[PDB]
Each structure stands twice: as structure tokens, then as C-alpha cells.
Symmetry: C3
Subunit: 374 residues, 3 copies
Amino acid sequence: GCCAALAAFLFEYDTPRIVLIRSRKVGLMNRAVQLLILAYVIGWVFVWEKGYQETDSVVSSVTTKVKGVAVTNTSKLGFRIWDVADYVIPAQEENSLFVMTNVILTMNQTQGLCPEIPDATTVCKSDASCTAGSAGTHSNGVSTGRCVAFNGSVKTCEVAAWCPVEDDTHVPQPAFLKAAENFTLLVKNNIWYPKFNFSKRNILPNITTTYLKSCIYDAKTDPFCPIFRLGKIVENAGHSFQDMAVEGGIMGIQVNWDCNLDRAASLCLPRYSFRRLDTRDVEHNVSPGYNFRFAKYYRDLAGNEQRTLIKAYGIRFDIIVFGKAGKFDIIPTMINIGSGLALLGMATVLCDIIVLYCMKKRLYYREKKYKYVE
Amino acid sequence: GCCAALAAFLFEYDTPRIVLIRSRKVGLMNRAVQLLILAYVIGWVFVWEKGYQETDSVVSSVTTKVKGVAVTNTSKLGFRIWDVADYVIPAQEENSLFVMTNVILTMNQTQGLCPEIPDATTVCKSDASCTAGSAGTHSNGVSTGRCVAFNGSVKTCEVAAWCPVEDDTHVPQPAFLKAAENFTLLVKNNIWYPKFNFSKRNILPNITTTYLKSCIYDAKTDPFCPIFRLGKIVENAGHSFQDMAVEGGIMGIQVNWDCNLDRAASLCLPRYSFRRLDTRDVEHNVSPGYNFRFAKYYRDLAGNEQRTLIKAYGIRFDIIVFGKAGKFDIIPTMINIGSGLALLGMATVLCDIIVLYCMKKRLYYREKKYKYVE
Amino acid sequence: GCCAALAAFLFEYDTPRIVLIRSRKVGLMNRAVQLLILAYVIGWVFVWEKGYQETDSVVSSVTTKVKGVAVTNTSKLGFRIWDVADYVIPAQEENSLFVMTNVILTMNQTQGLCPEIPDATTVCKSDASCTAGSAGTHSNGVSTGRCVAFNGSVKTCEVAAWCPVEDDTHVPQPAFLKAAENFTLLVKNNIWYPKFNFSKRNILPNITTTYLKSCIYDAKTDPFCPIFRLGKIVENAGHSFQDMAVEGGIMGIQVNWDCNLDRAASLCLPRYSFRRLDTRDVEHNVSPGYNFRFAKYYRDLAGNEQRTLIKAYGIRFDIIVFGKAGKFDIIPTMINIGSGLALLGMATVLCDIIVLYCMKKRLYYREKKYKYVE
Ligand SMILES: *[C@@H]1O[C@H](CO)[C@@H](O[C@@H]2O[C@H](CO)[C@@H](O[C@@H]3O[C@H](CO)[C@@H](O)[C@H](O)[C@@H]3O)[C@H](O)[C@H]2NC(C)=O)[C@H](O)[C@H]1NC(C)=O
Ligand SMILES: *[C@@H]1O[C@H](CO)[C@@H](O[C@@H]2O[C@H](CO)[C@@H](O[C@@H]3O[C@H](CO)[C@@H](O)[C@H](O)[C@@H]3O)[C@H](O)[C@H]2NC(C)=O)[C@H](O)[C@H]1NC(C)=O
Ligand SMILES: *[C@@H]1O[C@H](CO)[C@@H](O[C@@H]2O[C@H](CO)[C@@H](O[C@@H]3O[C@H](CO)[C@@H](O)[C@H](O)[C@@H]3O)[C@H](O)[C@H]2NC(C)=O)[C@H](O)[C@H]1NC(C)=O
Ligand SMILES: CCCCCCCCCCCCO[C@@H]1O[C@H](CO)[C@@H](O[C@H]2O[C@H](CO)[C@@H](O)[C@H](O)[C@H]2O)[C@H](O)[C@H]1O
Ligand SMILES: CCCCCCCCCCCCO[C@@H]1O[C@H](CO)[C@@H](O[C@H]2O[C@H](CO)[C@@H](O)[C@H](O)[C@H]2O)[C@H](O)[C@H]1O
Ligand SMILES: CCCCCCCCCCCCO[C@@H]1O[C@H](CO)[C@@H](O[C@H]2O[C@H](CO)[C@@H](O)[C@H](O)[C@H]2O)[C@H](O)[C@H]1O
Ligand SMILES: CCCCCCCCCCCCO[C@@H]1O[C@H](CO)[C@@H](O[C@H]2O[C@H](CO)[C@@H](O)[C@H](O)[C@H]2O)[C@H](O)[C@H]1O
Ligand SMILES: CCCCCCCCCCCCO[C@@H]1O[C@H](CO)[C@@H](O[C@H]2O[C@H](CO)[C@@H](O)[C@H](O)[C@H]2O)[C@H](O)[C@H]1O
Ligand SMILES: CCCCCCCCCCCCO[C@@H]1O[C@H](CO)[C@@H](O[C@H]2O[C@H](CO)[C@@H](O)[C@H](O)[C@H]2O)[C@H](O)[C@H]1O
Ligand SMILES: *[C@@H]1O[C@H](CO)[C@@H](O[C@@H]2O[C@H](CO)[C@@H](O)[C@H](O)[C@H]2NC(C)=O)[C@H](O)[C@H]1NC(C)=O
Ligand SMILES: *[C@@H]1O[C@H](CO)[C@@H](O[C@@H]2O[C@H](CO)[C@@H](O)[C@H](O)[C@H]2NC(C)=O)[C@H](O)[C@H]1NC(C)=O
Ligand SMILES: *[C@@H]1O[C@H](CO)[C@@H](O[C@@H]2O[C@H](CO)[C@@H](O)[C@H](O)[C@H]2NC(C)=O)[C@H](O)[C@H]1NC(C)=O
Ligand SMILES: *[C@@H]1O[C@H](CO)[C@@H](O[C@@H]2O[C@H](CO)[C@@H](O)[C@H](O)[C@H]2NC(C)=O)[C@H](O)[C@H]1NC(C)=O
Ligand SMILES: *[C@@H]1O[C@H](CO)[C@@H](O[C@@H]2O[C@H](CO)[C@@H](O)[C@H](O)[C@H]2NC(C)=O)[C@H](O)[C@H]1NC(C)=O
Ligand SMILES: *[C@@H]1O[C@H](CO)[C@@H](O[C@@H]2O[C@H](CO)[C@@H](O)[C@H](O)[C@H]2NC(C)=O)[C@H](O)[C@H]1NC(C)=O
Ligand SMILES: NS(=O)(=O)c1cc(NC(=O)Cc2ccccc2)ccc1Oc1cccc(Cl)c1
Ligand SMILES: NS(=O)(=O)c1cc(NC(=O)Cc2ccccc2)ccc1Oc1cccc(Cl)c1
Ligand SMILES: NS(=O)(=O)c1cc(NC(=O)Cc2ccccc2)ccc1Oc1cccc(Cl)c1
Ligand SMILES: *[C@@H]1O[C@H](CO)[C@@H](O)[C@H](O)[C@H]1NC(C)=O
Ligand SMILES: *[C@@H]1O[C@H](CO)[C@@H](O)[C@H](O)[C@H]1NC(C)=O
Ligand SMILES: *[C@@H]1O[C@H](CO)[C@@H](O)[C@H](O)[C@H]1NC(C)=O
């Protein structure tokens, strides 16, 4: 009878048959193991590690602005003023910003033939060691193979390049824009969590416009002013701006957005940390510090092309935004609950082993627990 | 006998002893709870939330191009033509593109001493309130401490800067390049899923070259033309291009790649959404809109250095590509199956509680289910 | 008695009652299924797929430098030298680098009225087909509606643009900087795993400074020299530099950081792969290859504004850094163990089905296993 079988299946309750053993040690051990398992599952997984939540990564957009003006009066270049349009090269970048702190200038360059800068490699005699067509270590010109005089004292191999060639052997010390220590950087950060449809910006609602006009970041006093001083950024990373400015470097400004969305949206706050992303190693490094070469192109009255070659040393400021949001989800909760329910049987397994193999009445309990079908 | 024990272990089947109770209410409740648990585990975890899949994030590369030419005839700068090489500063960026829509120009600047722009702070009398060496709010020059005349009417403090100083108080209205509304942006997006070795590009196979020559994106009609009109991009975000162009802003073009790889590769399509990434708040904001300063450097016939200072207002277009792919994996499937198997015991627990503590024959079932070993 | 009940709960051990059936086939099948389940759970989940680990994504910072000098002697532009400050436009980018390999130059441009380049669309007769105000396909100027003569042979519609207009129909072949094949690229990569507080850089500790001065990457011989040759980068992606240099393209340099942190930190090494991120399709593509337009602005002696329009073809080199680190975690371990414990009951279920429905003594075992409470 299909109907009778269906009724029996629906109208009958099936439960396992249990055997109760009065044993103080085994009972206490079983309860202790179960308590340890429950303490794990609750405290470590749910309360501590937030095992009831789904996680989403952040999508960020960053905007940077710099302020400050520097004054220099040197011999080669004379009195000058450096505003933001001068020392930030280029005017706009993405999640990054380069401030020039030291420079080498080669002005009024022309295409032609000229001697190389004296050194062990370039110095030649009798036009013999020179080889035509070789770019050389400098990669600034192509050798012609004709020894020519650099000055009345020494003679060097000739190259076809922009002339006169750059002499980048003597980096100015102290740095040229050493007042860049005192400039301020404003970081505007807008974040987005697509999974939870949540957006926020690093300028908090209680940060007024009057406050932003005179605040400088300070973890203890002003932990939410998004305006930083470059010297103090470098200092907070454990380094020195003056030392770091002679050859340049890379600094990371690190914004952390690790906020739980089960709470008020006013508690999703950014945390700022600073880290140097360049390494000082004089045995396992190539191209230390940080610099790059760009050129300014002009025209002579005769119509020929001039250029000024700038080797710009400075500090690059990268803005690194990371973090995960968390919101309650039922899938991980049920997974953890089921896993704990499964793990609760380990206590039964261990206690059964102890009862059946580590007692004097281990043959009585074996007879009671196991029923043999001959 | 080790061999006999091994044979018994391998050649004997162990199954629990069950107790069958004829109870309509308890049986129906047990079946209902089990049905609810199974419905959860199947529908919500597998069918709905795709609990049988492994997920991978996308790796994207974006290429942007702009088209359009604008014509202006103003008094200060005269008749001019603005092609792509003019209003896109710089010519190439990464996942970003700036179109200049409004400008302030300061031409023929030189290093020297000049008065500051009149205002409450700069205006001074009798050369008393001026303090030498102070950069000031503008950060455009360093004060010398000598009151000088701006014009026949007012007198302002003197600074050492590029002169004449920029007057950025009167932003032109309407915007200067208000025809940028009508320009078109082409976005080429190539994505990669390293885990699944899957690549695709936003120009679909059925998109021909003839179609791309005259199509403009439209969600209802042309949802897969990757050519957008800037005015319509701003409109689709709920804003106005003309209002947004006076001071500038930031727009995000958001490409979503959320495709299931268990299906045909022709169904992994991009979805475009637009969002404004800058906030209009006149009480909790600093540096609103969007702009930056860059300079053009020239040389006077005498050899001195000139510059033109440009304050460029405009809209930045950021391309944001996100999404996850999904493919069937056995690990999550088995995890979910095991979790459901574990959860199926909650029905037994609850029904046992009801049977042993909420019935008149709760002492008969207790005697039947539990067997005491004295 | 509450105290007595608590003592009984704490001092009594409860274990299920089991039924032992002597059946060779069923016992062997049960053991086989259990062995298969255990083999899965151990080998595939733990040993093979590393199911005992927590995963974190990488945070990377990249720095690129190029070396090489090229020489060209053409008719239009004459003898020239191309150093890094010339062919890298702009001098610095983020996770990217553009090397210019081919160029079209339009020098001494001025604002004014001039004919369009002859073609099917622009060619007009009797000043009839011209429409004033139409930007046209070129988007280089705004039509005035006046037919004008391009030369003694043909006549074209007039536009207001920078003049003379660019003629970008004949791309030079072979490429203009075809010696860029032989340049070298240095990639410096510093990675960070915030979850595990782990940092490393792609220049390994055993890579000395002497080695970096002459090494070129080669997977078989020098798999950890971070200096690459551009021609060999393009070759290792399955393409040709000379063919790819005429119109340009996009190459991805892909750094993989997939290292297990349960082992020594000296085994977290980068793996380099190369992939072309642009597609060659002459039926479903728009704007093939890769190029962009930038301008150089000058001043005529009379004070008017000149410009040189450069259409720069070249190869963009994107650095793509991805990977996940893994460290032992207890949460996934316990989850997998619990899931395996739950799955071990499938063998019991299947064997019970076989015993109770696929035997001649299926009515004896049913009577033995199930005890009915009337
Ligand atoms: C705007 O709202 C934020 C949100 O909290 C306020 O941030 C709070 O700032 C105070 C001090 O400015 C923090 O207390 C400080 O803690 C440091 C230790 O980190 C301690 O050394 C100081 O003596 C002081 O007690 C406070 O923790 C912080 N709130 C949170 C949640 O971290 C802010 O003050 C409000 N106003 C402004 C103008 O930002
Ligand atoms: C190339 O292949 C794509 C792949 O599907 C085709 O996209 C399809 O485009 C049509 C309309 O162009 C979509 O139907 C439209 O849906 C909107 C609602 O979103 C409705 O308002 C319209 O009236 C129309 O019914 C269709 O959904 C879309 N396919 C998918 C999967 O979304 C495309 O048409 C093919 N051809 C070209 C030239 O792109
Ligand atoms: C610095 O330490 C690294 C760390 O291992 C050393 O890398 C090792 O380099 C050798 C060859 O340079 C690799 O062996 C080679 O394998 C290829 C196959 O990929 C084979 O065709 C070659 O004949 C050779 O056997 C070795 O696998 C590699 N180590 C690892 C872990 O991959 C490096 O050699 C050390 N020294 C320098 C100067 O880098
Ligand atoms: C000193 C302090 C001690 C504190 C006391 C200990 C606190 C922790 C008690 C945890 C008790 C767990 O209780 C335990 O639950 C499981 C189910 O989960 C029961 O297990 C029973 O039901 C399940 C289904 O639910 C069956 O598959 C199983 O064969 C059967 O034995 C055990 O019979 C019971 O012992
Ligand atoms: C996120 C965590 C996931 C894991 C969740 C765990 C929940 C599991 C609930 C299990 C419930 C156990 O339910 C309860 O078990 C105890 C034993 O423990 C049973 O108690 C039984 O064994 C004891 C011990 O010998 C006897 O003293 C008692 O007379 C007998 O009835 C109760 O009759 C039952 O009501
Ligand atoms: C009104 C409509 C109602 C629809 C009917 C209900 C549909 C859902 C039925 C789900 C049935 C689950 O069936 C249930 O399976 C578990 C195992 O998973 C069995 O459990 C049995 O085997 C497992 C191992 O597999 C042992 O650990 C356990 O101690 C033992 O009781 C239960 O004895 C049985 O009741
Ligand atoms: C992704 C989902 C993961 C969870 C997967 C769940 C699968 C679990 C399978 C459990 C199989 C249960 O297997 C079946 O259980 C029922 C009870 O339900 C048993 O039935 C037993 O109890 C009932 C109820 O009192 C009696 O009417 C019946 O005579 C008795 O045999 C069957 O003898 C057994 O064949
Ligand atoms: C030919 C080579 C064969 C190799 C032999 C097979 C190797 C694999 C053996 C795996 C044995 C698993 O052993 C199996 O463990 C489970 C618990 O996990 C026991 O299950 C028992 O305890 C659990 C709690 O722990 C109870 O919920 C359950 O109702 C009860 O039956 C089974 O009674 C036992 O059969
Ligand atoms: C990451 C993996 C997660 C899964 C982990 C699995 C661990 C599970 C451990 C289960 C332990 C089983 O524990 C062991 O089970 C066997 C059956 O298998 C029991 O053996 C019982 O059944 C057999 C088979 O009929 C009889 O021959 C035997 O006389 C009887 O005692 C043992 O008395 C018990 O000690
Ligand atoms: C920059 O420094 C130079 C000298 O280092 C200044 O030039 C001299 O200034 C003094 C004091 O005014 C005069 O007496 C000299 O005649 C100036 N010339 C020389 C060659 O010494 C210069 O003035 C400084 N910059 C500015 C803006 O004044
Ligand atoms: C940045 O500003 C500080 C002042 O906050 C400068 O340090 C002071 O400089 C003045 C002269 O300008 C001295 O009189 C003080 O003795 C200095 N110390 C202090 C504590 O005020 C600092 O030199 C500036 N950074 C530069 C110029 O690079
Ligand atoms: C840009 O506008 C100016 C005036 O706003 C134009 O210059 C005048 O044009 C009219 C009409 O051709 C002439 O009659 C005047 O002599 C011109 N000069 C002045 C001072 O008004 C100018 O032509 C416009 N731009 C172009 C390219 O024509
Ligand atoms: C963008 O183009 C539209 C046309 O599609 C311009 O709007 C029209 O402009 C013409 C004159 O150029 C007027 O005659 C029409 O009445 C306008 N409206 C329509 C619906 O065609 C629009 O002005 C252009 N955007 C600019 C110039 O910024
Ligand atoms: C670049 O090539 C041109 C010719 O293609 C060279 O100019 C000629 O060089 C030869 C050989 O020295 C002379 O005899 C001619 O008088 C030169 N002029 C012409 C018009 O042919 C030029 O020298 C080459 N570049 C350099 C740097 O020498
Ligand atoms: C890159 O350098 C290679 C040499 O390693 C050039 O190929 C050689 O060029 C020389 C002349 O410069 C010839 O004599 C050789 O026969 C060429 N082949 C070899 C195997 O050496 C190659 O032309 C250079 N790439 C350029 C110029 O684009
Ligand atoms: N802010 S800016 O306009 O972008 C910008 C500012 C400067 N600054 C100066 O010339 C000041 C100076 C004077 C003397 C020596 C050294 C520096 C230079 C270049 C700038 O632009 C470019 C142009 C081309 C390539 C790149 Cl990479 C950037
Ligand atoms: N497309 S471009 O060549 O990159 C480019 C185009 C323009 N445009 C104009 O000068 C047009 C113009 C005229 C009058 C007023 C305002 C603007 C300016 C600079 C450009 O380049 C640089 C150079 C240095 C730094 C940076 Cl950030 C970018
Ligand atoms: N390295 S650089 O200083 O950045 C740089 C180098 C060059 N190179 C050349 O002019 C060499 C050349 C000569 C003849 C024809 C073609 C090219 C051009 C521009 C550069 O800068 C800008 C400035 C504005 C916008 C952008 Cl996008 C970049
Ligand atoms: C995200 O939330 C905003 C509300 O700020 C809403 O306008 C927008 O439609 C939401 N997006 C999605 C995809 O739900
Ligand atoms: C990815 O797939 C492509 C096929 O388009 C293949 O050439 C390449 O080798 C694959 N990469 C890996 C790592 O398997
Ligand atoms: C990360 O590790 C470094 C050690 O190299 C330590 O100085 C720094 O404080 C650590 N950061 C955190 C957040 O623990």
C-alpha cells in the first residue's frame, strides 16, 4: 500500500536508542570536551573572528592637492620662486604625487658631436680604444670612434648626442628644495562598497570648513584632518626628510577602511599609516632613491631646436587605500553552526574509545552498546 | 588475533538502533522542519546564492579616446579652435581622462616683486601689518614686508612671486568650453580572469566596424556601444553638464563584469553605470569642484624665463571596472552538503525535546529511548 | 531535585545503541565508501587544494626605468638622437610606460582657415555640398561652408582649425624608432600583504649589484633579473616587435606572487609572463593599434601662438601584479574536518538502504534495527 507507506513515513517519529552509563570521570570529560568545542565555536568563530559576516572589498577614488611656496637664491640659477605649478611634475597624477626636492640642470642643449664626461670608461688615448656605434653605459649618445679633447688636461671619446652632455655625478647637498619639508598635502578619499551599496568620504560629517582651514594631521590630537605636512609624513615613517630629499624616495600614505556595517555608518572611519616603499641597500640595489629625466624644448632664432634636460630628484607620495566591510549573512552563520554540530561528535567518539578500551568493565559496556545479529 | 580483529572490522556493518514512535503531530513537525531545512539548503544556498561555485576577481586594462572640436571667440583670448590635443590635459592617463571645460589664464609672468590681489587679508596701511617671510593663505609668494600700491585706490602687501599674480576670484560663467557637452568618449576595456584563464573585451563579437562609426550609448537602444557622449554621461548620473562645467567635478564610468562561466562565453557582458565621485557641500568641504594648476614656460628674447599660469577647471572621467566570475567547484558543494546533513539533526533534537518534555506519555518514551547500565 | 538532575546530567554518559550485521559485501562497501570520502577530504581538500589556509591579496608598488639611445637620419626631420627624455612620453607614469616607435609630425601650425585633406567626403564642387558648422569625421576643424582649393588639381571644403591640417593617412613603414627593439626596461616591484604583515621586493637578496649591471631576463638562464629587453618582451608574447611598432600596441608584463607563507620567506618569488592586451580585428574593432596626439606650443616673434602636432604611435607597457599568499588558519581546518565528519554518514545511509531494501533477510534486519513503541 503506497498510501499506507506514505502515512507511516509522515506519521512516525524515529529516534536513536541511547545507552546511559554512570561514570563520573567519563561524564565530566565528555562535558569538558563539549564545553571546549562550544567555547571555540562561539568565542573564536562568532564573537572574535566574526564568522557570521560576508566581506566586500573597497572601491576608492583619490584626489590630492599640495600647498607651499619655496625661495632659493643660488649662483647657477639665481633668485627664484617655486609655487605648486613648478615643483609638482606633472600637475596631476592618479593616486600619486611627485614633489621635486633636488635637481640637476643642463640648459641650451643641441644635437651634435661632443666629448663624453671624463671617467675611467670614457677616457681614451690616441683614438684607439674608442669603438664606433657603441651606445655605452651612459646611453646618452652613440660613439663615433674619434678621440676628442674634453679640456686642456684630459681627452675623452666623442659621441653624437644632445650637447653638452649631462654631468650627474655631483648631486647637490643639502637638497635644493629643502623647504618642501614644510609643505602640506590634502588627501580627499571617496570609497564605495558595491556589494552593500555603501559610500563614504574621508572628510567626516562633523569636520567643518573652518576646521579644515588650519588643521594639520596628528594621530593623538587631529586623527581625522586629511591635511598632512610632508616632513611630518616622512618623520612618522621613521625617516628624515632632509636625508631623503637629496636623492629622493617613495612614501606610501596608507588609508585603512575596516568598518563593520552592522553598526552605525558614523563608525566607518579611516586610519592613516605611513611606510617607505623604497629600500636603502648598497649591495643588492639598482637605481636607488628616486628620479627621472624630462626635457623642455625651445627654438633658436635661426629655427634650430634647443632643449633643457632636467634630472629631477624628489619624493613620490602614493596613496594606498585598502580594507574590507562586513555585514551579517546567514550562509556563513549556518555553515559554522553545522560545522560545530558535526564537531560535537568528537567528544562522543573519544569517550566511547575510553569506555570500550580503557576500563575494567570495558567488556560489559561493549556487550551493552553493541547488539550482534547472527 | 590481529587478523580476526581486522576481518571483523572489515566484514561487519554497524548501524544505530532506532525507536519508532507513532505520533501524528511530532511526525508532521519533524517532516516540516526537515522540509524547511532542505528548502533553505537547496534554494537559498545552491539555486539562489550559487553556493556551488568558486569566485575570481577581474584584471582589467582600459584605453580611452575623445573626439570633438570646439570654437570660442572671446575678448581676452580671441578666436580659437580646441581640438583633442588642446582640451585633454595630459594627452594620456591611466583609467582616467580630464577634459578642460573652464580656464583662468595669467600670461607673461616673470619672477620679481609685485603687489598681492586686494582683499581683507592682503590690504595693509602704512607698511605696518605686513610681515616679511610669511607665505600667506595664497601660498603664491613670500611676503617682503613692504606695503606697495596695487592701484591708485588701494594698497596691498608686496610679495616675491611670479608676477603679475593670478586673480582666481571670478570664475567665468557660463563655462568656457561649454561645447564639451557634445563630445564623445570611446572606452575600450579588456578583462582577464587569471584563475579560469578567461579573457574578453567590451566590444562584443557581433559589434561590427560599421556600427561603431555612428553609435552612441543608450541603455534601452544601444546598451553595448562603448562610445559615450559626455553631456549624456553627466545626465545619466542625475546631474547637469552646464552647471558641473563651471567649477568641474569627477564622474565615474563604472563597468560591471558579473558573469557566470558555467554558461556560454557569449553571456559575459558589461553593464555601464555612472556616478559622481565629488560632493557638493558648502559646510564640510575643502577645495570643491575640480581643478589644477600647470604652467607653460617660454623665453624672452633677452633670455629671461616667462611663464603662462593656467588654472584648469574641468571634469575628470574615471573608468572603474569591477566584478567576479563564477565556475562550479566541488569544495564548496561538498561543504554545503555536509553542513546541511549536520543541520538535519536539529529537527531530531527539537522533536526529542517535545516528546520527552511536552507529553503525557513523556515517561514511557523516556523509558523506551534511554537504557540505563547499572 | 535540581541538584540531582544537574549531577545526573554531568555524571552520566550517553552513547547510541548499535546493531552489528555480519555481511561481507556490505561491510566492504561501507569501508570502501568511507575510504573514498577520507581520501577526498585529505588529499583534495587539505593536501592538494590547501584547505587549511587563509588567503590574502597583494598590495604592490611598481617603478619603471628605460635605457637606450636611437639614431635616425631622415629627410623631413634630419639627423637626430633619441634618448630616454625624448621617446618616453610622459617621463613618468603609474604601473605603465609608453615608448614611442613611430610618429607623424605637423609643424608650424596656426589658427585660421585652410582646406581639408582631399578625400571622398571632403572633396566638393561649386561650394554646394559644404555645410557650415559641421565638425565632420576628422573632428579637427569646424566647416565654414566655402569651397577652397587644396592644390591646382582638386578642391576641398574649408575648415577653421589649426593649419595646415594633419595628414595621418601614410604611416611610415618601417617604424621610425625601430631601434627601440633593443632597449632595456627595469621593473622594480615591492609587494605587501597587510593581513600577514609580509613585505618583499622583486630584487632578491642573492641578486648582487654587479649582477644587475649586465643581466637580461631569460626564463631558463636568468629567471630573476628584473631587466627586460623590449624586443624580447614582445617576442615572448608570440608577436613581432617590428610589425607591432608601425601602428603600436599594448603589452602586459605580468608579475605573479603566489607564495605559501607557511614556508621560508626565501621561496616567495615572482614569475613573469607576457601578454598582448590589444586585439587585431579588421571587422569588429575601432581605433586599432595604439597612439595619441599631443602638442608643443611656441610663440612667433610677433607674439602669435604656434604649435607642433605630434601623432605618436608606440607600445604601452603595463605592469600587472597579482597573487595571493596563504598561511595556516584554524577556522577553515575545523570547517573541513566537520564537513568530512558529516559526510561520513552517507556511507551509513547507503548501506542501510542496501541492507533494508536489497536483501532476502531485509525483514530480519528491519525488525532488529527498528523498535516500535505501540
Ligand atoms: C569628529 O568625530 C570624530 C569621530 O570620532 C572624532 O574623533 C575623535 O577624536 C578624539 C580626539 O580628537 C579621539 O580621542 C583621542 O584619542 C587619542 C588616542 O587615539 C588620545 O590620545 C586623545 O587624548 C583623545 O582622547 C577619539 O578617539 C576620536 N574618535 C574615535 C571614534 O576614534 C572627532 O574628535 C570629532 N571632531 C573633529 C573636529 O574631528
Ligand atoms: C549584439 O549582441 C548583444 C548581446 O545580447 C545584443 O544585445 C541585446 O540588445 C537588445 C537591444 O539592442 C536588448 O533588448 C533590449 O532590452 C531593453 C531593456 O534593457 C528594451 O528596452 C529594448 O526594447 C530591447 O528589447 C537585449 O537585452 C540585448 N541582449 C542582452 C543579452 O542583454 C545586441 O542587440 C546585438 N547587436 C548589436 C548591434 O549590439
Ligand atoms: C638566486 O636565488 C634564486 C632563487 O632560486 C635562484 O634561482 C634559481 O635559478 C636557477 C637558474 O638560474 C633555476 O634553475 C634553472 O631552472 C630552469 C628551468 O626553469 C632550467 O632550465 C635551468 O637549466 C636551471 O636548472 C632555479 O630553478 C632557480 N630557483 C628557483 C627556486 O626557481 C638564482 O639562481 C640565484 N642566483 C641568482 C644570480 O639569481
Ligand atoms: C562542567 C561543565 C560542563 C558543562 C556541560 C557541557 C555543556 C555542553 C553540552 C553539549 C551537549 C551536546 O549534546 C549532545 O547533542 C547531540 C546532538 O548535537 C546528541 O546527539 C544525538 O542527536 C544527534 C542528532 O541531533 C544524533 O545524530 C546522535 O547520534 C545522537 O546521539 C547527543 O546525544 C548529546 O550528548
Ligand atoms: C554554533 C554551535 C553549533 C553547535 C550547536 C550545538 C547544539 C546541539 C544541541 C544538542 C542538544 C542536546 O540535547 C540534550 O542532550 C542531552 C545530553 O547532552 C540529553 O541528555 C541525555 O544524556 C544525559 C547524559 O547521560 C542523561 O543524563 C540524560 O538523562 C539524557 O536525557 C538530553 O535529553 C537532550 O535534551
Ligand atoms: C509534509 C511533507 C513532508 C516531507 C517529508 C520530509 C522531507 C524531508 C525528509 C528528510 C529526512 C532526513 O532523514 C533523516 O536522515 C538522517 C541522516 O541524514 C537519519 O539519521 C540517521 O543516520 C545518521 C547518519 O546518516 C546517523 O548519524 C543518525 O544518528 C541516524 O538517526 C535520520 O534517521 C532520518 O530521519
Ligand atoms: C545539500 C543537502 C545536504 C543534506 C542532505 C540530506 C540527505 C540525507 C539523507 C537521509 C536519508 C534518510 O533515509 C531514510 O530516512 C527515513 C526517515 O527519514 C527512514 O525511515 C525510518 O523512519 C521513519 C519515520 O519514523 C519510519 O516511518 C520508517 O519505517 C523508518 O525506516 C528510512 O529507512 C531511510 O531510508
Ligand atoms: C578495504 C579498506 C577499508 C579501510 C577501512 C575503512 C577506513 C575508514 C573507516 C572510517 C570509519 C568511520 O567510523 C564511523 O565513525 C562515525 C563517527 O564518525 C561513527 O558514528 C557514530 O558516532 C557518531 C558521533 O561520532 C554518531 O552521531 C553516530 O550516530 C554513530 O554511528 C560510526 O559508527 C563509525 O562507523
Ligand atoms: C578531515 C576528516 C574529517 C572526518 C574525520 C573522521 C573521524 C571519524 C572518527 C570515527 C571513529 C570511528 O570509531 C570506530 O568506529 C568503528 C566503526 O568504524 C567502531 O567499530 C564498531 O563497528 C565495527 C563494524 O561493524 C565492528 O566490527 C566493531 O566491533 C564495532 O566496535 C569502533 O568501535 C570505533 O572505535
Ligand atoms: C640673490 O643673491 C644675490 C647675491 O648672492 C643678490 O645680488 C646682490 O645683492 C646685493 C644686496 O642687495 C647687492 O649689493 C649686489 O649688487 C647684488 N649683486 C651681486 C652680484 O652681488 C640678489 O639681490 C639676491 N636676490 C634678490 C632677489 O635680491
Ligand atoms: C619649517 O618651519 C619651521 C618653523 O615651524 C622652521 O624652523 C624654524 O625656522 C625659524 C626660521 O625660519 C627659526 O627661527 C626657528 O628656530 C626654527 N625652529 C623652530 C622650532 O621654529 C623650519 O626651518 C622650516 N623648514 C624649512 C625652512 O625647511
Ligand atoms: C571674433 O569676433 C571678433 C569681434 O568680436 C571679429 O572681429 C570683427 O569682425 C567683424 C566682422 O567680420 C569685422 O567687421 C571687424 O572689423 C572685426 N574686428 C573687430 C575689432 O570687431 C572676428 O572676426 C571674430 N573671429 C573671426 C575668426 O572672424
Ligand atoms: C549639442 O548639439 C545639440 C544638437 O543636437 C545642440 O542643440 C541644438 O543646437 C542648435 C544650434 O546649434 C539649435 O538650432 C537647436 O535648437 C538645439 N537643440 C536641438 C534639440 O537641436 C546643442 O546646443 C549642442 N551643445 C552645445 C552647443 O554645447
Ligand atoms: C644625414 O644624412 C645627410 C644626407 O642624407 C648627410 O648630409 C650629407 O652628408 C654627406 C657626407 O658627409 C655630404 O657629402 C653632404 O654634403 C651632406 N649634405 C647633403 C645635402 O647630402 C648628413 O651628414 C647626415 N648626418 C650627419 C650628422 O652627418
Ligand atoms: C639589436 O642588436 C642586434 C645585435 O645584437 C642587431 O642585430 C645585428 O646588427 C648588426 C649591425 O648592427 C649586424 O652586423 C648583425 O648581423 C645583426 N645580427 C646579429 C645576430 O648580431 C639588431 O639589428 C639590433 N636592433 C635594431 C638595430 O633594431
Ligand atoms: N606642473 S607641470 O606644469 O606639470 C610641470 C612643471 C615643471 N616645473 C618646472 O619646469 C620648474 C623647474 C625649473 C627649473 C628646473 C627644474 C624645474 C616642469 C614640467 C611640468 O610638466 C611636465 C612637462 C613634461 C613632462 C612632464 Cl613629466 C611634466
Ligand atoms: N594634450 S597635452 O599635449 O597633454 C597638453 C595640452 C594643453 N592644452 C593647452 O595648452 C590649450 C590651452 C590654451 C590656453 C589656455 C589653456 C589651455 C596643455 C598642456 C598639455 O600637456 C601638459 C603639459 C604640462 C603639464 C601637463 Cl599636466 C600637461
Ligand atoms: N619625456 S617628456 O619630457 O615627458 C616628453 C618628451 C617628448 N618628446 C619629444 O618631444 C621628442 C619628439 C621630437 C619630435 C617628434 C616627436 C617627439 C614630448 C613630450 C614630453 O612631455 C609631454 C608634454 C606634454 C604632454 C605629454 Cl603627454 C607629454
Ligand atoms: C546605491 O544606493 C544609491 C543611494 O545612495 C542609489 O541611488 C543607487 O541606485 C544604488 N545602486 C544600486 C545598484 O542599488
Ligand atoms: C591561458 O589561455 C591561453 C589561451 O587563450 C593560453 O595561450 C595560455 O597559455 C593560458 N595560460 C595559462 C597560464 O594556462
Ligand atoms: C608590520 O611589520 C613591521 C616590521 O617590518 C612593523 O614595523 C610594523 O609595525 C607592522 N605593522 C603592523 C600593523 O603590525
